[PDB]
Design a protein around this ligand. Sequence first.
Ligand SMILES: Cc1cccc(O)c1C(=O)OP(=O)(O)OC[C@@H]1O[C@@H](n2cnc3c(N)ncnc32)[C@H](O)[C@@H]1O
Ligand SMILES: [Mg+2]
Length: 534
Amino acid sequence: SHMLDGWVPWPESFARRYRAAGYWEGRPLDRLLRERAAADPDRIALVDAAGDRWTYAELDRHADRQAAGLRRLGIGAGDRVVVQLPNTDAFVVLFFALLRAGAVPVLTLPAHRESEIVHVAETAGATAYVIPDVLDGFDHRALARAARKAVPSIEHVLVAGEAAEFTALADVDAAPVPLAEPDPGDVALLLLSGGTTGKPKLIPRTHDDYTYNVRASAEVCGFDSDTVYLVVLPTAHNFALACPGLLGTLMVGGTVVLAPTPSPEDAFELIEREKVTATAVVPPVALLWLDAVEWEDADLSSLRLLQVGGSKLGAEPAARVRPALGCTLQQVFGMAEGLLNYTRLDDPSDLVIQTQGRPLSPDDEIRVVDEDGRDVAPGETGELLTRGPYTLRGYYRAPEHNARTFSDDGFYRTGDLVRVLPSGHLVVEGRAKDQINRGGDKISAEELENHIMAHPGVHDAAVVGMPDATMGERTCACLVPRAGRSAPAQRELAAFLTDRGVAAYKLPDRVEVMDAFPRTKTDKKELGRRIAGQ
Ligand SMILES: Cc1cccc(O)c1C(=O)OP(=O)(O)OC[C@@H]1O[C@@H](n2cnc3c(N)ncnc32)[C@H](O)[C@@H]1O
Ligand SMILES: [Mg+2]
């Protein structure tokens, strides 16, 4: 028996083996903060961009008060709560407060707009939605009004800032109350994947598998109480939350430092000020930092570890990380679905430069298969399938997609093309899935195509990735015009999609109008050629 329906538990024989192996320890995710605050109450747990800071005891106490306040509003055992917050201390407190109340956080990104928010709130039957007031010039309260109109289950909107007619997140506060613990085998939180279908898919992560994710990642990355970790990616990104991210830093007793943006201005200042020793970035930001040290005077010497993942970091900039940034590079090929590959901190420099790591767990199972589904010869390129103690057996409330995306014996089909080397290290070689990787941001082609086809001048749309030297891929929207109408140009299409509530990283970089698409279904390899003029 589980608190939520709509997800796919592990078969009992696998659960047994993961508990016996010590992976699944039987503790709720919030216990990592409870235990650290009990052992190290006066250590500095969290520092925000302004320079305010909190001890483990202070953070633990505040999570308890906000948990009790959430219960006063009726937010509790099993309720799904959409969270959309910036990199501020409000997120960290609310994350643990939701857990201790028994609510299930549904983590979205600040950049998400009405289309994504309404879909995940709908799919999760969410009862509450947590927003900033205004962030990066966008008023999220209007989005919450639009979300409430489309999703009647949303009863509460909690605002970090001026709450307008809603509830101020700072007012969610009460005397702590005895709160029951959740079952560690139950879903702890729901992550968002870019996906490959017409809707983003929700990833259920349980207490046991996410604690293992965090704990084993912290071990491999050498996180301990001496770690000062700079959250440069959004707190809701799996990379920065749990790999090992801020949760790993808190588990082991380090200091989490929140960066408001990844710019050198903000990040280089916080690295020097707080003596940051570790952080995680996407390759476009790695390239930006590698340039910026040549004109920035910040002392970055405290940096010991730079994790880079989300798209493939090239071998040439990878080799520059030690000379330029004075730290160890760790390549990370991970996914919110589960499987994490890490280079080890003492791997020979060859493997740090040339590979995307080897799997985190001894019981991460790897298969590399050809177009027919048969295992490739060792060292051949094929699609990566994987199964393990923290990789899902199915997406949340997506039966039909689950039937397509998981093999009969439970292997998740990643859509990534890889080689496995004799050492077990992976080299990422490409993608099989119909999803564009734009600087680490994942763009489901089918979701974007359906948005574009809603435009009155558009009859058909095929979204095609274009190689880019610093962004990895850009987005080209190939358009068949509506019968007797003109298709829009780039700027009109972007305005249409923004008004429709499409996150800005999904806006096409380029529009190409044509009479028909090549057919094999649409042949996107041939579309690439026609786009390139060949
Ligand atoms: C980066 C990361 C670290 C830890 C936890 C995460 O969760 C994530 C993350 O990126 O989460 P995503 O959900 O975006 O997963 C989509 C994934 O990104 C692609 N990818 C990811 N790292 C890659 C790399 N180092 N080199 C080439 N490609 C990579 C694949 O396509 C794959 O499937
Ligand atoms: Mg149309």
